[PDB]
């Protein structure tokens, strides 16, 4: 008897076969293109996509006017549209089976900081977010994997206390300007 919860889940699955060249090359491609730390982040996003595809196939086995199929398919499609992975006009459970890992990778905060020109590269974007230079609508975010919603796409701003933002300079600039 403790007032503690023990509920937790693993957020990835390891691949079944360890050393396959095509899978290794595809994972390395996605790591390099999206500036990721290791293979586990690719496996995490792959796990999320596999769970969503399993939910879509399960709802596709149901008949069209099943209330659970309509309710849960509508909720799943609404979530996928809300994080920008699917288009608003493609709200249909068949198109979920055509989704790719690259859309979920593009909706990360690292990729959006790169694509909105706040960073000169994807690795610059990662080190920018990690060092409290980025805010999303009011809130400083450190997490590169922060998945951005379409309502927060236009509010990625740039940290009103950051030296490149609000203006108060960093440690190096005060130390170097103090010499002379």
């Amino acid at each position: 008897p403790v007032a503690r919860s023990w509920v937790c889940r693993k957020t990835y699955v390891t691949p079944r076969r360890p050393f396959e060249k095509s899978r290794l090359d595809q994972e390395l491609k996605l790591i390099g293109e999206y500036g990721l730390r290791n293979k586990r982040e690719v496996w995490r996003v792959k796990f999320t996509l596999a769970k969503i595809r399993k939910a879509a196939r399960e709802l596709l086995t149901l008949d069209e006017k099943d209330p659970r199929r309509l309710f849960e398919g509508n909720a799943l499609l609404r979530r996928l549209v809300r994080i920008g992975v699917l288009d608003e006009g493609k709200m249909k459970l068949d198109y979920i089976l055509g989704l790719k890992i690259e859309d979920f990778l593009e909706r990360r905060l690292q990729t959006q900081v790169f694509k909105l020109g706040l960073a000169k590269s994807i690795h610059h974007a990662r080190v920018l977010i990690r060092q409290r230079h980025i805010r999303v609508r009011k809130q400083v975010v450190n997490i590169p994997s922060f998945i951005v919603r379409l309502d927060s796409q236009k509010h990625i701003d740039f940290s009103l206390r950051s030296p490149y933002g609000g203006g108060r300079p960093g440690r190096v600039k005060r130390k170097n300007a103090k010499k002379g």
Binding site: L28, G32, R37, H123
Partner: peptide, 20 residues
């Protein structure tokens, strides 16, 4: 010298593998 670690080691391996 020292080898890079983390995201930088993977970036180096990617630049060697797919860029050239």
């Amino acid at each position: 010298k020292k080898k890079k670690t983390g995201r930088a080691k993977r970036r180096m391996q990617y630049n060697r593998r797919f860029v050239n």
